[PDB]
Structures are given as C-alpha cells and as structure tokens.
Amino acid sequence: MRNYNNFNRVWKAPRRPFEKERLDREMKLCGQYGLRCKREIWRVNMTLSKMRRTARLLLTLPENHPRRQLEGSAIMRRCHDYGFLEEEKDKLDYVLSLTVPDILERRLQTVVFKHGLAKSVHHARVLILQRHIAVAKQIVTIPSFIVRVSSEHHIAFADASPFGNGRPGRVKRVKRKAA
C-alpha cells in the first residue's frame, strides 16, 4: 500500500521460439561482442523498436504540424548523440534505417577494444567490471553503458587502478605480506 514507484519491462521475447535463421543471427553477435545472454540482444531491439515507431508516426504527418516539428527535432538530436548516425541526417528516414549493430557498437565493452585499451573482447568485459576504467573521471563497472559521441575521448583508465597509479595489486600485495 501507498508506494508510487514505477517499474516496467524492458526486453520482450520473440514469438516462434525455434527458427533456424533467428538462432544463427543471435549466436553470431553473442560471441563477437561477448554478450552474456540472448536477453541482451533482445534488450537492444526493444529501444530500436519504440524509437522507429514514434519516428514513423511522425513521418506520416503533414509537414509543419506541431507534434512533428517538436518531437522530431529531439529524436533526431539524440540519434546524433549516442552516435547512432551522422550529423548529416535530418529527414526522419535515417531513423528507421537503423539496425541492431549500431546500438551494440556504442556499448562500453565494444568501445574499449577499439581504442586499444584491451587485447580481446571478453578481456574488455572483465576489465570494466573489475573496476579499471573511467568515462570522464567517473568509474564505471557496467559494460552496457552507452557512450555518447562527446564523451569518447575521455575514457582512458581510472587512477585508482594498479594500471594507473595507487595501491598496487592483490597478487603482489599478498606476496609482500608473506615475505
């Protein structure tokens, strides 16, 4: 009684649960990006849906209609920040043209690999979770953090890391007690 906090689903399962084509696609991504489960590959498809949904309802409308101007502008803005698209898109068709990879490729676990701050993909998931990364000066332990276009250059390594400065290791520190 009398709590007004809200909760809602993100992911929803696909209909028709055994399909050879689907299972191919899923799997292929799931180890290329090092994703834990199928739950993640569905989670992204969710966002992508609701996005293109609104954008389509807008595209329908006569030009210069109130909702189309307002809402349109803002949708387009935040599909250029989170860098799903170029800044040279503006026609509200490029929105609908998006596919699953564009989303995935901005998740932190991806980005790490590309700026050569980890050797492998599975390596990079580990590395974020066990607390050796930053995104401005703020320490992130979640690999599913979407990275904005403006953020990217700042990622580096954290300095509470052994890989930065301060307070070396667990391995080392235990040995150094024993001796």
Partner RNA sequence: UUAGGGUUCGAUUCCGGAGAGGGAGCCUGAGAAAUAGCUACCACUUCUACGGAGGGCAGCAGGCGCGCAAAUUGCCCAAUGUCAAAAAAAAAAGAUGAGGCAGCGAAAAGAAAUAGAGCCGACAGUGCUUUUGCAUUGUCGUUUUCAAUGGGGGAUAUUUAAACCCAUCCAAAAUCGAGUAACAAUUGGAGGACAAGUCUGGUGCCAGCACCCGCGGUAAUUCCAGCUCCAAAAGCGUAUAUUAAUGC
Angle between helices 66-77 and 38-59 (to 10 degrees): 150
- Binding range to another protein, per CB under 8 A, among 60-68, 69-77, 97-105, 130-138: 130-138
Residue 8 site contact among RNA, another protein, none (CB < 5 to 8 Å, cut-off depends on kind): RNA
Question: What single-letter amino acid sits at 14?
Answer: P
Residue 78 site contact among another protein, RNA, none (CB < 5 to 8 Å, cut-off depends on kind): none
What is the C-alpha to C-alpha distance for residues 45 and 99, in angstroms, rounded to an integer? 9
Q: Binder to RNA among 100, 160, 164, 165 (CB under 7 A)?
A: 160
Q: How far is CA 104 from CA 65, 151, 166, in A?
A: 34, 17, 33
Nearer to RNA, 85 or 126 (CB): 126
Burial class (CB in 10 A: 0-12, 13-18, 19+), 24: exposed
What is the C-alpha to C-alpha distance for residues 16 and 86, in angstroms, rounded to an integer? 35
50 Cα distance to chain centroid? 16
Q: How far is CA 165 from CA 115, 159, 162, in A?
A: 20, 5, 6
Examine residue 130 and tell whether it contacts RNA (CB under 7 A). yes
Examine residue 100 and tell whether it contacts RNA (CB under 7 A). no
Nearer to RNA, 70 or 160 (CB): 160
Q: How far is the CB of 80 from another protein (least distance, A)?
A: 29
Q: Binder to another protein among 59, 61, 139, 156 (CB under 8 A)?
A: 139
Q: How many CB atoms lie within 10 A of CB 125?
A: 21
Nearer to another protein, 79 or 108 (CB): 108
Which chain residues interact with another protein by CB under 8 A?
27-28, 30-32, 34-37, 122, 125, 131, 134, 137-141, 158, 160, 166
Residues binding RNA (CB under 7 A)? 1-4, 7-11, 17-20, 23, 26-27, 36-40, 43, 119-120, 122-123, 125-126, 129-132, 142-144, 160, 162-163, 166-174, 177-178
